C-alpha cells in the first residue's frame, strides 16, 4: 500500500482537514486542549475528543491504511483474527516455557522508528506547498507532544485508536529478529502486545538459562526496548499465564493442553452461588462486578427505584452474556485446534448450563 496526496484528501481527510489543503495551510499538530489525561494506578492514558478532526482522520487512517501494511505472524494482538488463545496455542508442543515482558511499550517507541517504518508505504512528497511533507502530515495525527518526561519529542500515547497498529508495524523488525533467533535455537515464539512467550519442545535448559535473557535483551536494545525483570517466568512442564494453564508432561512429540484455573473462574462461580442463594442483585452488582450508579446521576426526575432495579438487572444480564460468550469462544477455539482438556470442557459445559439457567430465571423474574 502506497498513499499520495489524492488518496489522503479523498479517503483519509475526506472532510476533517479539508480547509487546510485548499487555503495553503499546514496541518496543525495535536494541542493539549483536545487531549485529556486519565489516571489509573501509575499508568496514564490520552483520550482525544471525538469532535477533533484528528480523531476522525486517525480513525480513517486505521481503517484504510494501517490495516493493509504486512505484519509478522508472531504478533497475535491488535490484528484481525488475533486473540490471546492464538497467542497461547503454539506453545502446546513445548516442554519448557519462558514468559518475558517489555518495559512501558508505547512510551519507549521512538517516533523516528515510526517514521522509518511508515516511510515505505507513504510517498515522499510535499503536501502543503514546500512547507510540510506527507510524512509529517500523517504522523501529526498519530503522536502527541506529552507534557511530561521532560518533553523529549513526540510520543505514541497509550489511549489512541492508531497506537496498536503502529506499534505492531514498528515492532515487526524485532519480531522477525527474535523469531529468527528462536528458530535457530528451536524455540516457538509468540507475542501479545508486549508479552513474549517462548516454548522449547526439547529437553534443554535454554529457557531457564541467562543466555536466552541476555540475547533477548541485546536484540531489544537495537530499538531501545528493555525487559521487565519483575515479571520473568521460566518453568518446566507447566505454566500459568493470567489464569491460563498450559500443561505438557512429556517429551519427544507430546501434545500439551490449555485450560483455565479455578482462580480465573472463581468470580463467576461466586456470582452463580449468590444467585442460587437468592441474594439481592444490588450486592452482586456492587461487589462481584463493581458496577454502581455513580453519584446518583439519574439526570431526569422520575421513578428512580424502577430505573435502578432495571439497571442492576440488565447489567447482570450483560455480565452473564459476556462471560458465556467468553466460555463459548474458548470451546470454539478448542473445536478449531483441539488443545483443551476434556475435563475442562466438561466443566465449562456445566458452567455454561448453569449460566443459561440463571439468566433464563432472571429474565422470567423480569
Amino acid at each position: 500500500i502506497l498513499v499520495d496526496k489524492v488518496f489522503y484528501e479523498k479517503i483519509l481527510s475526506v472532510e476533517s482537514f479539508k480547509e487546510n489543503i485548499i487555503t495553503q495551510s499546514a496541518i496543525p499538530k495535536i494541542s493539549n486542549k483536545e487531549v485529556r489525561l486519565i489516571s489509573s494506578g501509575s499508568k496514564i492514558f490520552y483520550a482525544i475528543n471525538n469532535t477533533s478532526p484528528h480523531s476522525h482522520v486517525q480513525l480513517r487512517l486505521n481503517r484504510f491504511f494501517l490495516s493493509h501494511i504486512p505484519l509478522n505472524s508472531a504478533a497475535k494482538a491488535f490484528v484481525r483474527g488475533g486473540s490471546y488463545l492464538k497467542y497461547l496455542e503454539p506453545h502446546i508442543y513445548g516442554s519448557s516455557y519462558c514468559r518475558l515482558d517489555i518495559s512501558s511499550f508505547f512510551n519507549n517507541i521512538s517516533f523516528d522508528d515510526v517514521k522509518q517504518s511508515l516511510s515505505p508505504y507513504i510517498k515522499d512528497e510535499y503536501l502543503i506547498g514546500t512547507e510540510q511533507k506527507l510524512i509529517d502530515a500523517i504522523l501529526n495525527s498519530v503522536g502527541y507532544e506529552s507534557p511530561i518526561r521532560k518533553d523529549k519529542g513526540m510520543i505514541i500515547p497509550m489511549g489512541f485508536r492508531t497506537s496498536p497498529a503502529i506499534s505492531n508495524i514498528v515492532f515487526r523488525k524485532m519480531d522477525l529478529l527474535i523469531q529468527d533467533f528462536c528458530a535457530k535455537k528451536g524455540v516457538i515464539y509468540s507475542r501479545y502486545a508486549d508479552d513474549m512467550l517462548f516454548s522449547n519442545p526439547r529437553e534443554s535448559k535454554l529457557l531457564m538459562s541467562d543466555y536466552f535473557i541476555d540475547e533477548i535483551s541485546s536484540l531489544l536494545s537495537i530499538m531501545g526496548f528493555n525487559i521487565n525483570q519483575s515479571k520473568y517466568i521460566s518453568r518446566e512442564k507447566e505454566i500459568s499465564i493470567n489464569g491460563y494453564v498450559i500443561e505438557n508432561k512429556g517429551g519427544n512429540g507430546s501434545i500439551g493442553t490449555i485450560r483455565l484455573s479455578k482462580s480465573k473462574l472463581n468470580t463467576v462461580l461466586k456470582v452463580t452461588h449468590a444467585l442460587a442463594q437468592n441474594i439481592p442483585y444490588k450486592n452482586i452488582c456492587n461487589k462481584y462486578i463493581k458496577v454502581r450508579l455513580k453519584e446518583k446521576n439519574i439526570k431526569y426526575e422520575s421513578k428512580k427505584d424502577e430505573f435502578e432495579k432495571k439497571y442492576y438487572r440488565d447489567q447482570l444480564i450483560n455480565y452473564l452474556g459476556g462471560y458465556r460468550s467468553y466460555l463459548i469462544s474458548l470451546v470454539k477455539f478448542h473445536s478449531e485446534y483441539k488443545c483443551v482438556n476434556s475435563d475442562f470442557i466438561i466443566q465449562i459445559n456445566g458452567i455454561l448450563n448453569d449460566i443459561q439457567n440463571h439468566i433464563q430465571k432472571i429474565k422470567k423474574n423480569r
Binding site: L71, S73, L176, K184, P201, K249, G250, N252, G253
Partner: protein
Amino acid sequence: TIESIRVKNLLSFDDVILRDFRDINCIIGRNNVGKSNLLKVIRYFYAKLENKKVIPLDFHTNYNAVGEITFTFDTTRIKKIVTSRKNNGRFHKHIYNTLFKSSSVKLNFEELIARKNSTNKSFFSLTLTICKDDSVMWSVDDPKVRSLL
C-alpha cells in the same frame, strides 16, 4: 494412523490444518494450485524424513522468518503391539525404545502408568521448521525417530 497436517507460511498456505482423516478422503475444488502445494508439502516432509537433499519450499510471505509443517501420527495400535508382553522381537523393542520410553514412562508414579493405557489414544507430533537461511530444524533431535516414522 495420521490425524493432523498443519502448514504455516509455506507456498500458498498461511495457517492451514487438515484433520479428521478418513479412509477414502477425496479432494475437490477449483484451486488446483492449492492441491499441488499440499502435495509438494507432503513430499518435502517425507523427503526430509528420509534425509534427502531437496530444495527448501518457498515462504508464503517474506515478513515471517519461519515456515512450519506439523504432522500428527496416531500411534495407538503400534503402542498396543509393542507394549504387549508376548512379542519380544528386535524391531518391536527398537520401536518401543525409539518413539516411546521417557516422557510418560518412568517419569511419573506407577498408578499413572497403570491407568495410562485403558481406552485413550496416543499421538506423536513432529515439526519441520524452515528458516530464512534455507536451514531445516526438527522438533525432535533424533534421526532414528524420523527414520522409524
